[PDB]
Amino acid sequence: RICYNHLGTKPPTTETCQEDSCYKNIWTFDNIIRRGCGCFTPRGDMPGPYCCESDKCNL
Numbered sequence: 001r002i003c004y005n006h007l008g009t010k011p012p013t014t015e016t017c018q019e020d021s022c023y024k025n026i027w028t029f030d031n032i033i034r035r036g037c038g039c040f041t042p043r044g045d046m047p048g049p050y051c052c053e054s055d056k057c058n059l
Contacts, residue, residue, distance in 0.1 A: 002055035004035030014056050024058030025049025035059070 003022030006012030008031035017037025024035035027047060035058035039051030052058050 001037065003037040003052075004056050004058040006033070006035045006059070008032035008034065012059075020053055022052045022054070022056070022058035023049065024052070 001020045002014055002016045004012065004024065005015030008028065010031060015036070019038030021038045022035060023037065023039050024033060025040040025047070026033050027040070027042075027049060028034050040047065040049040043051070050058055
């Protein structure tokens with residue numbers, strides 16, 4: 001659905017996707033935070049990223 005596509009420091013913008021969820025985690029590759037659609041990959045208690053089930057919910 002419409003989730004946030006803001007990339008850590010990159011310019012923050014929303015992005016429509018298929019997963020009604022929105023994943024926003026600090027773990028990434030070159031940047032740091034990344035808001036997308038769905039949940040992160042290593043879901044668990046060790047990591048503390050942010051997944052959600054609403055549009056633009058990972059702001």
